[PDB]
Amino acid sequence: GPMDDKELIEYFKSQMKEDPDMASAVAAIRTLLEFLKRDKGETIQGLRANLTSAIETLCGVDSSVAVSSGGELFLRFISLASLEYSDYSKCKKIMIERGELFLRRISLSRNKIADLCHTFIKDGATILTHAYSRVVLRVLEAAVAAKKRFSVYVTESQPDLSGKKMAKALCHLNVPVTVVLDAAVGYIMEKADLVIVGAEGVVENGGIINKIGTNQMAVCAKAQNKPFYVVAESFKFVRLFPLNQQDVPDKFKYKAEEHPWVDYTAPSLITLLFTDLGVLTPSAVSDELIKLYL
Amino acid sequence: GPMDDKELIEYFKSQMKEDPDMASAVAAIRTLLEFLKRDKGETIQGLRANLTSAIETLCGVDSSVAVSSGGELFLRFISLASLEYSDYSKCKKIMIERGELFLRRISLSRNKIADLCHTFIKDGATILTHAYSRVVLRVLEAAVAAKKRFSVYVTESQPDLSGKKMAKALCHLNVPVTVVLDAAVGYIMEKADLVIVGAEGVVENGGIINKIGTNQMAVCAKAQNKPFYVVAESFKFVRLFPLNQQDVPDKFKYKAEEHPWVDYTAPSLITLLFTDLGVLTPSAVSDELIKLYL
Amino acid sequence: GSELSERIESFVETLKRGGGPRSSEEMARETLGLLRQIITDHRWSNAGELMELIRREGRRMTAAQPSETTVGNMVRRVLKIIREEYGRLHGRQESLHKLLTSDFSFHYAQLQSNIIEAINELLVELEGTMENIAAQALEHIHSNEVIMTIGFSRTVEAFLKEAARKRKFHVIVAECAPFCQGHEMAVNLSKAGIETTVMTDAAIFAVMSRVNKVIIGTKTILANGALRAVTGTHTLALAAKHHSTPLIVCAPMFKLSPQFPNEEDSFHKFVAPEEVLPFTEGDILEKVSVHCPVFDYVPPELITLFISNIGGNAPSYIYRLMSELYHPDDHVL
Numbered sequence: 001g002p003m004d005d006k007e008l009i010e011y012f013k014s015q016m017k018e019d020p021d022m023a024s025a026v027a028a029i030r031t032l033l034e035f036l037k038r039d040k041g042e043t044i045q046g047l048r049a050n051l052t053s054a055i056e057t058l059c060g061v062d063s064s065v066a067v068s069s070g071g072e073l074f075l076r077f078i079s080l081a082s083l084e085y086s087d088y089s090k091c092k093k094i095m096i097e098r099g100e101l102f103l104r105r106i107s108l109s110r111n112k113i114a115d116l117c118h119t120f121i122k123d124g125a126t127i128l129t130h131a132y133s134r135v136v137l138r139v140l141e142a143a144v145a146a147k148k149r150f151s152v153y154v155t156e157s158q159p160d161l162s163g164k165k166m167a168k169a170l171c172h173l174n175v176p177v178t179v180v181l182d183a184a185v186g187y188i189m190e191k192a193d194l195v196i197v198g199a200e201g202v203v204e205n206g207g208i209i210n211k212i213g214t215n216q217m218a219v220c221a222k223a224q225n226k227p228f229y230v231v232a233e234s235f236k237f238v239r240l241f242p243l244n245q246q247d248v249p250d251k252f253k254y255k256a257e258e259h260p261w262v263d264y265t266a267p268s269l270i271t272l273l274f275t276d277l278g279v280l281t282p283s284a285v286s287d288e289l290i291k292l293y294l
Numbered sequence: 295g296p297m298d299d300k301e302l303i304e305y306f307k308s309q310m311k312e313d314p315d316m317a318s319a320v321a322a323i324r325t326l327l328e329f330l331k332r333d334k335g336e337t338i339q340g341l342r343a344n345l346t347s348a349i350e351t352l353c354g355v356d357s358s359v360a361v362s363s364g365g366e367l368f369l370r371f372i373s374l375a376s377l378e379y380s381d382y383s384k385c386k387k388i389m390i391e392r393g394e395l396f397l398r399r400i401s402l403s404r405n406k407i408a409d410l411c412h413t414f415i416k417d418g419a420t421i422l423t424h425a426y427s428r429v430v431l432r433v434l435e436a437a438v439a440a441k442k443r444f445s446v447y448v449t450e451s452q453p454d455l456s457g458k459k460m461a462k463a464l465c466h467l468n469v470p471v472t473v474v475l476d477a478a479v480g481y482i483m484e485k486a487d488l489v490i491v492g493a494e495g496v497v498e499n500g501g502i503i504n505k506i507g508t509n510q511m512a513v514c515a516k517a518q519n520k521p522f523y524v525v526a527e528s529f530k531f532v533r534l535f536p537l538n539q540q541d542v543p544d545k546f547k548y549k550a551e552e553h554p555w556v557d558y559t560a561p562s563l564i565t566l567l568f569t570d571l572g573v574l575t576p577s578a579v580s581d582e583l584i585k586l587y588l
Numbered sequence: 589g590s591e592l593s594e595r596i597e598s599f600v601e602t603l604k605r606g607g608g609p610r611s612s613e614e615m616a617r618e619t620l621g622l623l624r625q626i627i628t629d630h631r632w633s634n635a636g637e638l639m640e641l642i643r644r645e646g647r648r649m650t651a652a653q654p655s656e657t658t659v660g661n662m663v664r665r666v667l668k669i670i671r672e673e674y675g676r677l678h679g680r681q682e683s684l685h686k687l688l689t690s691d692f693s694f695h696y697a698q699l700q701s702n703i704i705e706a707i708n709e710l711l712v713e714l715e716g717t718m719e720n721i722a723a724q725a726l727e728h729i730h731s732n733e734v735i736m737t738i739g740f741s742r743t744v745e746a747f748l749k750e751a752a753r754k755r756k757f758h759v760i761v762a763e764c765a766p767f768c769q770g771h772e773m774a775v776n777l778s779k780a781g782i783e784t785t786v787m788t789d790a791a792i793f794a795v796m797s798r799v800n801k802v803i804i805g806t807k808t809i810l811a812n813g814a815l816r817a818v819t820g821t822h823t824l825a826l827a828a829k830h831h832s833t834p835l836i837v838c839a840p841m842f843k844l845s846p847q848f849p850n851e852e853d854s855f856h857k858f859v860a861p862e863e864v865l866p867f868t869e870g871d872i873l874e875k876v877s878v879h880c881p882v883f884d885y886v887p888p889e890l891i892t893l894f895i896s897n898i899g900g901n902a903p904s905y906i907y908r909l910m911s912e913l914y915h916p917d918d919h920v921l
């Protein structure tokens with residue numbers, strides 16, 4: 001049909017490359033909606049199947065949790081829209097309008113998270129971060145714009161040195177930052193006042209899926225009574241319930257000796273989550289997911 | 295004097311290079327004994343001052359805790375020998391022979407530790423180690439010689455990839471081993487059954503000084519109820535009482551943005567210590583140090 | 589008009605200078621009455637003007653005494669009531685469902701009557717809060733139990749007095765120094781036949797190993813389930829957590845504040861150092877820093893159960909209750 005796999009991959013990669021600030025999940029949702037724009041279908045069943053296959057191949061392109069989260073969120077949005085309108089033409093118009101509004105709303109979640117999270121940073125505080133994260137950079141920018149002075153520590157993230165990139169991006173706005181080894185998490189924990197990390201995916205029970213080194217930092221902060229804050233967008237709410245590290249699906253661990261790319265952090269190790277919905281406890285994510293799915 | 299700083303450093307380096315198996319502390323003690331052999335002195339005060347200066351120079355050569363521990367142990371040995379015999383001429387021969395016997399015992403200490411420690415590894419176990427350690431390698435060699443089958447996980451030890459060296463040395467004797475990132479200790483902790491690491495220095499309260507990634511590894515093992523075993527020689531017992539990570543002397547952290555080379559692990563995070571004195575609780579190190587110094 | 593202005597000024601000055609309504613329920617009732625008088629007497633056309641007026645008045649009262657969260661809670665409850673009435677009379681929360689599936693200028697003649705009757709219903713529910721909380725005492729206290737309390741909480745006093753009508757137990761009261769109001773609680777409980785012990789806060793840990801559960805009151809409940817309690821309550825909570833002793837907070841629903849613990853340096857109430865170090869010390873007072881915080885912050889992880897007029901709840905559910913009482917746009921006020 002229209003826009004086969006090659007065009008879908010090309011559009012996804014073009015959206016990712018044109019705006020490096022935009023997250024992978026936002027680009028995936030944009031690609032799915034723009035696929036919805038030109039489908040030339042007559043039934044909602046074929047539309048749902050085509051969208052499912054598009055999500056499958058998009059997750060084949062990128063093995064991140066956020067892409068799958070966006071795909072499931074888009075499928076739920078399509079089902080909710082179909083629930084209200086029986087005629088396919090009116091349903092499609094409503095889906096296009098609601099998708100445009102949804103894209104507008106999710107394009108500005110980062111600023112809302114920054115405005116709601118920068119208040120938790122105190123003057124002269126020592127902030128510990130794990131790896132590169134656009135949301136953490138944005139909240140630190142908002143805190144700097146508030147005429148607040150603080151120091152930041154970041155790990156180097158050995159697999160790909162995104163910690164160095166985060167350090168350069170923070171030096172860009174004149175923020176005193178330090179780069180430490182991934183093995184120096186426990187050593188430097190006693191100097192940090194609070195820990196702020198991002199998340200690639202928020203699981204059902206309130207835990208998070210994040211870069212491979214997040215669990216160590218969370219456990220070390222728990223052992224020293226340090227607050228552990230997670231900044232994450234709403235579209236990263238996954239209905240997954242891992243029981244341990246081995247229970248994480250293998251499609252997210254690898255291809256993104258034994259070198260997993262992500263790990264899971266339990267809700268008991270997290271103080272608060274900063275989302276576009278607000279400041280939440282880990283118990284609120286499960287309530288949101290339950291409310292979404294009837 | 296009879297031996298100069300330049301040739302003292304040359305002898306230390308040559309003794310280290312000729313036998314790569316011998317540890318830095320053993321080489322330092324051998325160099326100090328050789329310095330005592332050719333001193334041409336007649337006063338125990340000048341001998342003590344010259345030995346202290348030699349220990350200062352040797353610790354300036356390499357910034358390891360074990361070298362300083364060996365220096366303090368040698369100073370205590372000299373003080374005990376002087377207490378036993380008042381006359382310097384009769385004391386020097388006693389010091390020389392006692393030092394020869396001490397060298398023999400500290401050479402047999404590694405095999406003693408391996409023999410006393412290999413029994414704690416079970417068939418089909420998963421042993422987690424942090425970086426390269428000759429004592430851990432010898433322990434695993436003795437376990438393999440006992441017709442025992444087990445798997446080993448090692449961390450790459452990012453500042454200098456000694457974990458890869460340990461993995462190669464373990465593959466040399468056909469041991470199934472895996473290499474993981476320093477950020478994957480918490481992820482892989484649930485797979486391991488017990489943890490064995492080395493120690494560069496054993497502090498007064500039973501804690502250890504080790505490579506930068508040891509503390510977080512011990513905390514992660516504690517969070518999952520995994521036994522944390524430490525193999526360390528007796529000549530690494532030092533009367534130091536670090537209250538936190540910042541309390542560790544700076545002469546051991548650096549020269550061996552910011553990158554410390556060592557960290558401290560509290561005795562409450564350690565199950566048992568395997569030394570040439572036997573299997574000990576962390577409380578026994580303080581008793582040993584108190585008994586040594588009257 | 590003039591009488592309303594005098595009442596508002598008197599309330600603001602009483603809040604600024606302390607004293608006034610000792611009971612938190614009395615303060616909530618007075619705040620609700622003041623808001624009702626503001627709605628009745630002041631002239632407004634649509635819901636927007638009324639909301640702005642209420643916002644200004646609530647800002648003034650909150651700035652008068654930031655530690656008294658009951659006034660701000662009442663202001664936000666009235667604002668939420670106004671919003672609900674306007675939405676019911678005009679039309680037909682942030683969530684993933686609302687995000688996926690996609691104006692107060694209009695005037696209505698009967699909106700004011702609906703607001704007034706809703707406020708009256710809220711006051712009526714407020715009058716019976718203490719009895720509702722105390723009616724659950726028997727479900728949480730068994731025979732020959734040991735209860736630990738700190739300070740003087742009227743809700744906890746009613747709880748224990750109701751429980752003592754049918755069960756025998758022991759109560760330990762810690763005097764919340766410097767204002768040792770725990771003595772009044774101890775003598776009041778002893779007058780009701782309950783066997784009570786008086787001790788200082790320094791012994792809170794020491795006797796904690798012989799305590800079965802802890803029942804305490806609070807001044808404020810934060811959005812994450814944290815507590816603004818009397819000073820020394822954080823130590824009591826830590827001691828209870830050390831022994832896995834359950835900690836029960838008997839707090840009415842009107843003490844819930846949609847604020848978060850991000851605010852600093854205004855949380856605790858600092859009073860004159862005379863309560864801690866007397867003025868008669870002399871010269872040494874010139875070079876000694878004396879601080880007397882009245883209130884303490886208790887993290888939600890140290891609290892086991894919240895007992896309110898609607899029943900028992902876990903701290904992890906507090907957010908949902910906070911979603912049912914206050915609109916997210918009124919948090920800043």
